[PDB]
Amino acid sequence: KRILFIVGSFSEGSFNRQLAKKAETIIGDRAQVSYLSYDRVPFFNQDLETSVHPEVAHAREEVQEADAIWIFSPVYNYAIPGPVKNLLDWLSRSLDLSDPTGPSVLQDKIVTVSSVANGAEVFEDYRSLLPFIRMHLVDQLTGVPINSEAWSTGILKVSAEKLAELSAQADALLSAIEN
Structure with missing residues (x-):
């Protein structure tokens, strides 16, 4: 198996990256975990779609090679972190320039989310968006608060x-990939 981890933070000590390390460990060898680097991605815009952007081609393959995807992201003002939405704006684009209405790399990709913050409304954004851009959302999302x-x-x-919750979530994700 292959699971791609995506952290909604670029800081090294992020509480969400720390949660991601724990997740990577609870699966151990049941799956080959890897992290996605997208520190530098062009600001998305349609007039640029006919152009090749290395950082975008990169992320596209990573998702194409992966069996599933696990997003560990913080919530900014109740929303999906800007850099993450921008990444999805690119990854959700049709793989064919001849066919604007064709499938992107996100087509049918198994995905699930975890976040480390304090809120009621945490995963509402992801629950509506990820399925809409044609992904298969394993709806067993674990929200972890921050100890003082x-x-x-x-x-x-x-x-x-x-x-x-997190280990069960890792199990539900492994089974989905199984079926």
């Missing part, structure tokens, strides 16, 4: 109950 100690140690601590 992490604010000074910079280290995220997850309860055992939440850690259970």
